[PDB]
Amino acid sequence: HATGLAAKTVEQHQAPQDLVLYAGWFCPYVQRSWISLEEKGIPYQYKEVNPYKKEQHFLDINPKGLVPAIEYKGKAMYESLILCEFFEDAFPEHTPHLLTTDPFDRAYVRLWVDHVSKQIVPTFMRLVLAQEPEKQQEHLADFYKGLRTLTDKVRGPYFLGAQFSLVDIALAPWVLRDYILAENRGYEREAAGSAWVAYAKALETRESVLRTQSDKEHYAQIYARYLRNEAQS
């Protein structure tokens, strides 16, 4: 179960609601969708899914079995980024608009969300799973490269500037987890450049992000998560 401030948030979201969020406290993809709900003040019921003992209703409405998922007005959806966009569409008067209202900026947000999903997050995983120091160093260099492609475009404090957006939300969960890299894979924020130092700090101090954060897990736990993902591959 969730701990820290996240435990407070879970306890405040036990009541039934039209929107049900099927979550895992540990899951960074869930955190993306959870941050969006906390940013926009959308009402939601939080249900904790134990992946080792998934309940039957969850599987009926969500047979692929991933979190996050939602049920809303009797229909179900999954995929963290799709849910983030769905919250924008389905609660149109619940500001902030995390894609902006501007058509080009919305496209630019989607482009850089894609960079997070395609480059940054997969390399984070490959670095955790790299075994030889040489392969670890190669994947760490690639992590820096992918971080720096993004920080080249960060206006500050957030990706678009003052306006928090889905680019920030897509990435923030992995900032919260980068102590794993610092403690086990030779990473330091400073080695990716000062812009990353400042942007990481901005993401991890965002109040919505803090409200979804549990106590730090151990390396063995996340490594176990990645081996389970491999086993489901």
Ligand X SMILES: N[C@@H](CCC(=O)N[C@@H](CS)C(=O)NCC(=O)O)C(=O)O
Chain residues that interact with a copy of itself, rule: CB under 8 A: 72-73, 75, 77-79, 82-83, 85-86, 89-90, 103-104, 106-108, 110-111, 114
List the Cα angle 117/191/125 in 5-degree steps: 30
Q: Taking CB under 6 A as the criterion, which residues in 7-66 touch ligand X?
A: 24, 27, 29, 51, 65-66
**8 A C-beta contact, residue 140 and residue 187:** yes
* Residue 85's binding partner out of a copy of itself, ligand X, none, with CB under 5 to 8 Å set by partner kind: a copy of itself
Amino acid (one-letter) located at 117: S
From 19, 27, 167, 181, the catalytic residue: 27
Select 51 or 96, whichever has its Cβ closest to ligand X.
51
Show the DSSP H helices in the chain as ranges: 4-12, 28-40, 56-61, 80-90, 103-115, 121-129, 133-151, 166-176, 179-184, 194-205, 207-211, 219-231
Instruction: Look up residue 170 and give its amino acid.
Output: A
Lateral strand order in the sheet of 19-23: 45-48, 19-23, 69-72, 75-78
Q: Is 84 a catalytic residue?
A: no
The yes or no reply on residue 79 touching ligand X (CB under 6 A) is yes
CB-based contacts of 191: which residues, under 8 Å, 6+ apart? 144
Q: For residue 67, state whether it binds ligand X (rule: CB under 6 A).
A: yes
Q: What number of chain residues touch ligand X (CB under 6 A)?
A: 12
Q: Which is nearer to a copy of itself, 25 or 108 (CB)?
A: 108
- Residue number with CB closer to ligand X (67 or 160): 67
Residue 87 near residue 37, CB atoms below 8 Å: yes
Kindly tell me which of 48 and 105 has the beta carbon lying closer to a copy of itself: 105
Residue 80 contacts ligand X per CB under 6 A: yes
Which residues make up the interface to ligand X (CB under 6 A)?
24, 27, 29, 51, 65-68, 79-81, 228
Catalytic residue set: 27
